[PDB]
C-alpha cells in the first residue's frame, strides 16, 4: 500500500440504496446535488461520488440528461474531482450503467470488482409507510438481485471508459473483488496507481467487522504491493469507525449520505457537509491531513478537470 | 469451531467444472460414478459428493433418472453418506438444479451460500483441441457468468430440502458468504451443527492463499461460535495444502477429481481413491483420525440412509 | 472480550521512561502529580495511573513515602481510581517495586506480565546535553536492561496484593504474555474480570504496527472469552492512532505523559489533561462514551475507594 | 519471505530442555549424539542444531571439550551443516554459552533474539520419581528463570561469532523477537539472508496456536520482506502439525528430539531419525521437496565446511 501523506476524503452524496422515506435530506434534485456537492467540496471533499435521481420521485436513474444538469454546475463551483457511478440503481442493464460515464468522459468513474448478492430488504421494516410507490417494491426486490460485473462486464467496462483517459474508483465488497482486480492488473487492462475502496456493510457483501479491513489490506498488499491506495465505506452506523480505521492505516476515506443518513447516533444528517466536517476533524485530531481536489488529482494520476465532456 | 475428533473425508466424484478433454480418468457414466464412489469409500471417504454428467459426452446434467442410475448402486454397495448436488452444471435454472435433490430426498445436500463470478475460462488456453463441440462454448461462456444463488434462491432451497429433513454442505467461496449464511442462522431457516465448506482457489471467488483460510475459521468463530464444522476444499495443485492446513486446524477435508484433475505435482490421478488414500496418509502422519460413515452422520446430525428415496 | 458500553480513560501521568530533559512538562513534585492527576480526572480521567520520582531531579523512585504526599491529596480532589505501579523505576528490585502497593493497598496496582527487553536507549540521542547526571547513564544502561516478571515473581505478586483485595491491570508487551497470563487464570491466582493492557511501541516488546492489535484481541479472546476488558497505550506518535483503534474495536484508553511527551505532531503536551481532553473528543465523535470512576469501579470490580490505606 | 524451493529441515538432537527421566532415547554422550545426528543426516536432516550433556548423567554442558568429541567425528560421517547453540544450558552465562561457537567457528550458530521467561516446571509433575539429583531442581528453578538476551549481550553476539563468517538461526520466541531483529538489520550488524527460526508452546514464549505461526510470516514480511527464510519449531505434540503449516507456507522444519521426545500420539521417539523420516514423508505428500547439505549452503549463504575450527 501507497502511504497516503494526504488523505482523500470522497464525498459520495445520495447513491441509490437510500429512498426518500427514509430521510427529508437525501439530495434528489440535480439543484440539490449540486448544493450538496459544493457545501461537501467545501468542507474538504476532494472527490465527489454522484449518481442522479428522478426529480420528482427521487427513484433512481442513470440517464445523461440529469447527470448533465449538475455536472457543469458543479465543476463551475468548485475544483473536486467528479466521479460518475457505473453502478447506478439496482436492476439497470450494464447499457444504462455505462451511459453516463460514456457521455461524461469523466476523470474518475466507479467501477465495481464483481458479483454479489446486495440485499437491502431489510431496511423497508424500518418503515410503516413509504411516500413513493417504487420503494418498497425497489427494497423488497433486492431479496432476488444480484449487483452484475461479470469478467466480461468488467473488462467492457475497462476498455470502453479507459479509451477515453478515465482512472477508476475500484469498488470491492469481498476479498474475492482483489483477486478479481488482480486478474486484470496481471493482464495490464488497468495502469497504476490503483484506487481501490473497500466496502463493508452490503448484505452480501463483506460485514463490517474490523478484522475484515486488516485482512482485505493484507491481501491488497501481496496482490499489489506498492502500487494501490486503500479507501474505505462503511454502511450506516459503522461509516465512522470504519474511515477512522482507514485513516490510522494510512488509507483514505468516503463519507456521504449515499452510505449513511447520520451525522451521528440517533441523528440524521441535515447535510453531507455534516459527516466531511466530521471525519475531517476526526484526521486533524490524529495529526493527519487532507488531499486538496488537485493533490488527489495527482494521487490518481487522473486526466485533468479540462479533459472532460461537461 | 467444533472440534473434528474423527476427520470427515469427503469425495467429490466428477463435478462440472473438468471437462473430458482435461483427464480420460474423469468419471462420466453412472457405471464409473458407482466404481469411483465406491472406490472413494473404501479408501476412507466417510460421504461422496455427487453429480451426474450425459453418458455419452459428459456434459453436466440435472437429470434425476441419471443420478438414479448411481444412488441407488452406491446405497447398495458402500454406506457412505450421499451428498446431492444443487449446484450442477453451470448455466442451469434452479428449477433444474433442485430437482435432483427434490427427487431423491438425501441425507446432504449442497448449497451455494453467495452469488458470484465463477470463471473458469483460461482452462481453455490449455488444450489446443477438444474431444465435444460442447466444452470449449461451456468454459469461454463463464467469462460472462454468475453462480447465481440470491437470498430468495437460499431461502428457497433451504425451505423446500429442509422440509424432507436434507442437511446442507454449506459452500462459502468468499467472506461475504459466512455473513449471508449467519443471516438465515438468525432467521432460524437452519439449526445447528452447521457443515461449512470454505471454497478456494475460483476465480471469481477467494484466492487459495494461506491467510484466507484462518480469516474465514476467525470471522465464522465470531458469527457461529461452536454450531459449526469446518470442511476445505481447494482447486487444482492447492488441493492437498489447503486440505491438510483444514486437518491441522482441527477441520475437515474434501478432496476429488471434481475438484483437482492430478494426483500429485504434474501427474493426473487416475481414481478418486488415490487422493482419498493421499489425504488419508497426511492424516495419519499426523496422529490424527478419520470418520467412519456413521460417525459422520453422528456430526451432522443427518437423518439416516434408510430415510432417503432411493 | 466484553465491550465497553462506557470507555474507561486511564491517564498515566509521569512513569519513569521519559526524562526532566525530555520536557519541561514532565510532572516530577508530588504537588505537580498532584495537580495533574486532578486535572486529567476533570478531564475524563476515571483512572490514574502513577509513579513518583525524586522531587529534586526526577529520578524514577518507588519509596512509598513519596507516593503519602500525593495519594491522600488526589484522594481528596477526585474520585478517580488510582492505580500504583509495580513496574516502577527500571533497575529496582521486587522488594522495592511492591513497597508502595503493599503500603498503600491499592484498588488497582499494574502487573507486567513477562519478561522482556525493555530499551529506551535511543532516545539519548535525540539530545546533546542532559540537566541531571543520572539521566544519560539510566537511558544508556537500558541496551542490557530486562524488564523481570518471573512466574515466581508474578505469583508472588498475585498472592501478597491480590490479599488486600487489589485488583490487576495486567500489562502485557507481547502475544506471549497474554499466554502467561492464561497459566494464572487457569490455576485462579486472579479472578475475572481480567483487565488486559496491551503495551506497543517499546524495543524489546511489540512493535506499533496496527494488526498486532488485532492480533492480540483474536488470541485473548481465544485464551479468555468474555472474561476480559481490552485497553491499550503505544508509546510517543503511536498514542493517538492505536487509543483510538482500541475505541473502535471495543475496547479501553490510556493516555499520559508517561506514554507520550506529545499532545500531537511536533507539540510538547503542555498537561496530561490535553491527551485526555483529546482521545475523550476522538469517543465523542465517534459517538462513543466515557466512564465514570464509579462506571469504572464497576467494571473492574474494585474493592472501593474507602477500602484503601490512604 | 523467499520461498523456500528445497525445504530445509534441521535437525536439533538433544537440546537441554528434556531431561534423562523423560525417555531412554534422549541422546546424552559424545557418541549418541554423533551416531543420532548422523541417522538423522541421512533421513534427510540438512543441517544439525547441536548441544552437548555431561556424559555420566546427561546435565546441560557448554564445554567446548565435550563438543570437540562430537563434531570432528560428525564432520567426518557426514556433510550436514552443523549448527552450535548459544541458547545451551538454562541458568549459563553468556561467557559460558558463547565458549563452544567461539571454538569452533562453525558455519551456523543459533542466536535467541530476545530475553523471555523460559518456564519447563510443568513437565516434573509428569514424573513422581528422577534418575538423576539435578533434574527436579533443574526444572523447578526454570519458574523463576528468564533466558537472557539482552541488546548488549546479541550485539556482542553478533560481533565475536560474525568476525569469523558464522551465519545465524535467528530464535524468534514472540512478535517482538522480530522487531529487535528488524533493529539490528537496519544498523547493518547482520546481512541477509535471514533465517528465521518462529519458536512456538514454550510457556514464557508464543503459544502454539496456528494464528501465530502465520501472524509471525505477515509480521516478518512487513519487516524484512524478501530478505528471509521462515523456519518452525513447535514443543511436543506441536511439532508435526507446526513444521507441516511451515512447509505448506513455504518455510522450512526443524524436528529432533530437543524440541519433542514422541515419534506420534503417545509414542516416545526410539531416535531422531525417526521425526525426520516422518516430516519428509509428509513432504514428499504435498509435492515438496527437501535441500541437501549444499543446496542449506548456498541458501543460507555459509562460509562452507573447510573454514570451521573442528
Ligand atoms: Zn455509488
Ligand atoms: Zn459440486
Ligand atoms: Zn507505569
Ligand atoms: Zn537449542
Same mark, same amino acid.
Given at each position: 500500500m501507497k502511504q497516503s501523506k494526504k488523505i482523500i476524503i470522497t464525498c459520495a452524496?445520495? @447513491?441509490?440504496?437510500?429512498?426518500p422515506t427514509m430521510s427529508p435530506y437525501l439530495p434528489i434534485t440535480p439543484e440539490e446535488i449540486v448544493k450538496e456537492g459544493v457545501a461537501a467540496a467545501e468542507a474538504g471533499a476532494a472527490m465527489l461520488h454522484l449518481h442522479a435521481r428522478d426529480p420528482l420521485n427521487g427513484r433512481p436513474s442513470q440517464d445523461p440528461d440529469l447527470f448533465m444538469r449538475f455536472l457543469p454546475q458543479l465543476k463551475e463551483r468548485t475544483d473536486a474531482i467528479l466521479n460518475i457511478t457505473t !453502478? !447506478? @440503481?439496482? @436492476?439497470?442493464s450494464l447499457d444504462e450503467r455505462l451511459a453516463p460515464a460514456r457521455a461524461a468522459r469523466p476523470e474518475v468513474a466507479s467501477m465495481n470488482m464483481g458479483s454479489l448478492n446486495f440485499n437491502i430488504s431489510q431496511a423497508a421494516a424500518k418503515f410503516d409507510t413509504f411516500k413513493f410507490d417504487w420503494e418498497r417494491p425497489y427494497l423488497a426486490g433486492t431479496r432476488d438481485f444480484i449487483l452484475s460485473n461479470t469478467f466480461s462486464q468488467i473488462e467492457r467496462g475497462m476498455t470502453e471508459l479507459g479509451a477515453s483517459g478515465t482512472r477508476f474508483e475500484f469498488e470491492c465488497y469481498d476479498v474475492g473483488h482483489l483477486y478479481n482486480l488482480a486478474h486484470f492488473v496481471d493482464r495490464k487492462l488497468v495502469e497504476p496507481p490503483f484506487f481501490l475502496q473497500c466496502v463493508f456493510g452490503i448484505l452480501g457483501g463483506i460485514g463490517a467487522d474490523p478484522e475484515n479491513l486488516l485482512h482485505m489490506r493484507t491481501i491488497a498488499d501481496r496482490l499489489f504491493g506498492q502500487d494501490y491506495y486503500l479507501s474505505v465505506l462503511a454502511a450506516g452506523r459503522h461509516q465512522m469507525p470504519f474511515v477512522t480505521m482507514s485513516a490510522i492505516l494510512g488509507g483514505n476515506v468516503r463519507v456521504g449520505l449515499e452510505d449513511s443518513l447520520y451525522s451521528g447516533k440517533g441523528q440524521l444528517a441535515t447535510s453531507n457537509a455534516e459527516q466531511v466536517r466530521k471525519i475531517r476533524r476526526i484526521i486533524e485530531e490524529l495529526s493527519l491531513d487532507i488531499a486538496t481536489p488537485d493533490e488527489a488529482r495527482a494521487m490518481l494520476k487522473t486526466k485533468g478537470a479540462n479533459e472532460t465532456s461537461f
Open positions: 452524496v445520495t @447513491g441509490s440504496i437510500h429512498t !453502478g !447506478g @440503481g439496482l @436492476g439497470m
